[PDB]
């Protein structure tokens, strides 16, 4: 999964 | 008193009671006065932890759902539990978006570009969390609201914020995640993340120690996403 | 139906939603049938996590409460928040104790020693959690109820259960903690813990490969407490 | 640190 802030 | 509600939010945080923390900052927000940077951070931390717990539970249950085999009885119970968590998540998002639309974005003066970007990014985030669990026609509507909120934030931030600013970098990070994970548009995601990264590199020699740490942290996440996507 | 409530408890546990997990096992218990070993463990894990979150929050707030600026308004907010968490903790304990008194201990046959000790230990545990937060005149009764439950559990396990049995070892562990922390009686606490530890050491050859871990884990905790206390 | 009970 892509990292968000 | 307002100061005691903010103290209550800090106490609830130490007690790891994030529902209480969000309720306290919701009350502070509904006093219809602008939030300080400290209050704004408390509100954001509270609801990120509240919705983050719902999101984590949803992914666990949804992953099990995609594994329940052909058993009709077991599928119904897992999917009914997923839906219960889903409705909790949607109610949390609806609370945040009402706070943003009725108080936080509304009360921003014309020169409060930093706050506008912060809250519009938040609006894009919580519509994105709605899109993570929506299907069919209901998904398309929240996807459009998310892209619209992110679009304004990016346009304001490009014009009024330094490329190294953590809010501008965090916006570009979450907006690129929106493109990759929600819109399934990896080319748009990769371009946005790389542009934001390169735009911040050009002026990193200018930061002091405190700003260098916040910016390089988000820049590391941008690089991690780009490596994952390639 | 019953299997679907139990599956719901297993799902809630995976999602780390322990309020839901406890609600499901409370429903299973109120069906007035004996709990299997897995159902009994699911019930215990659920409420241990629910009350443990309340206990952990109470300890943070109570510690913060003992801290002053002369701000009577800040002290009043902190103590009112402590009381809110306190009443939540007491309500959880009241729910578990009602389950134990009305269903779980009640449905134990005269020769069901393992379940009887397990549920009586649980009864002593949750009165001990009430005693952790009670003050003044109300404290004596929950302290007395806790000791009474532990004492009966102790007599049954001493007569009918092997010293290496994890339920007998865990009873002695929590009973010794009750003596040390609630009764401020270190000599009695050390004697109870050391006797149980040595009685289990003498019969360590009797543990199997599968049983060894549950017992030795508690035996390490017994030693750790004795090391702390001496 | 503090006394340990059954986990």
Author numbering:
A (entry chain G): 445 to 449
B (entry chain C): 3 to 70, 73 to 234
C (entry chain A): 3 to 69, 72 to 234
D (entry chain E): 444 to 450
What wording appears in the published article?
Nedd4-2 activity is regulated by autoinhibition, calcium binding, oxidative stress, substrate binding, phosphorylation and 14-3-3 protein binding. The interaction between the 14-3-3 protein and Nedd4-2 is mediated by phosphorylation of three residues bordering WW2 domain: pSer342, pThr367 and pSer448. We demonstrate that phosphorylated Ser342 and Ser448 are the key residues that facilitate 14-3-3 protein binding to Nedd4-2 and that 14-3-3 protein binding induces a structural rearrangement of Nedd4-2 by inhibiting interactions between its structured domains.
For this purpose, we crystallized the peptides containing the pSer342 and pSer448 motifs (pep-S342 and pep-S448) bound to 14-3-3γΔC (lacking the 15 flexible residues at the C-terminus). The 14-3-3γ isoform was selected based on crystal quality. However, only the motif with Ser448 has a proline residue at +2 position, thus resembling the canonical 14-3-3 binding motif I (RSXpSXP). Lastly, we determined that pep-S448 binds to all 14-3-3 isoforms in the low micromolar range, showing the lowest KD values (∼6.1 and 7.2 μM) when bound to isoforms η and γ, respectively. In addition, the KD values of synthetic phosphorylated peptides are two orders of magnitude higher than those of recombinant Nedd4-2 variants, indicating simultaneous binding of two motifs and/or the participation of regions other than phosphorylated motifs in the formation of the complex. Overall, these results support our hypothesis that the pSer448 motif is the dominant 14-3-3 binding motif. The final electron densities of both peptides allowed us to trace seven of ten amino acids (Leu338 – Thr344) of pep-S342 and (Pro444 – Pro450) pep-S448. In both cases, we were unable to trace the last three residues of each peptide, presumably due to disorder. Similar contacts between the phosphopeptide and 14-3-3 were also observed in the 14-3-3γΔC:pep-S448 complex. The main difference is the absence of water-mediated contacts between Arg445 (-5 residue with the respect to pSer448) and the side chains of the 14-3-3 residues Arg57, Arg61 and Glu136.
